[PDB]
């Protein structure tokens, strides 16, 4: 789809058979999701944002289907204010900015 920006670019994602809303976030290097359980090994990581730095858990090679488009990659889980899809997965689903 083409998505205009008069509203937040919120889409439905499927991850581990669960549906969530997440924000398509071109200003985010990394995809960060709110607290949830995912299987497999994770590694402790810290990441910065506008308000300071937070601890997250890093899960690798996680399938997410984002508004119908399949990605498999890194998902950080932690105290993000909202589920964000970052450039690491936006590139996988072919997402570009156009004007």
Ligand X SMILES: COc1ccc(S(=O)(=O)N(CC(C)C)C[C@@H](O)[C@H](Cc2ccccc2)NC(=O)[C@@H]2CN(c3cccc(C(C)=O)c3)C(=O)O2)cc1
Q: What are the residues binding its own copies (CB under 8 A)?
A: 1-6, 8-9, 23-29, 32, 47-54, 67, 69, 80-82, 84, 87, 90-91, 93-99
Distance CA 61, CA 66 (A): 15
- The values of phi and psi at residue 81, to 5°, are -65, -30
Distance CA 26, CA 32 (A): 13
Distance CA 35, CA 76 (A): 10
**Smallest distance, ligand X to C-beta of residue 31, A:** 8
Nearest to residue 85, comparing CAs of 16, 1, 21? 21
- Taking CB under 6 A as the criterion, the residue among 11, 22, 24, 28 binding ligand X is 28
Q: Of the two residues 38 and 88, which places its CB atom closer to ligand X in the complex?
A: 88
From ligand X, its own copies, none, which one binds at residue 24 (CB under 5 to 8 Å depending on kind)? its own copies
Active site residues: 25
Sites of contact with ligand X (CB under 6 A): 23, 25, 27-30, 32, 47-50, 81-82, 84, 86
């Amino acid at each position: 789809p083409q998505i205009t920006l008069w509203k937040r670019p919120l889409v439905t994602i499927r991850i581990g058979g669960q549906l969530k809303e997440a924000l398509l976030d071109t200003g985010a290097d990394d995809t960060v999701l709110e607290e949830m359980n995912l299987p497999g090994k994770w590694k402790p990581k810290m990441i910065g944002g506008i308000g300071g730095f937070i601890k997250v858990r890093q899960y690798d090679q996680i399938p997410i289907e984002i508004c119908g488009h399949k990605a498999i990659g890194t998902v950080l889980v932690g105290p993000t204010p909202v589920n964000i899809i970052g450039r690491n997965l936006l590139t996988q689903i072919g997402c570009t900015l156009n004007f």
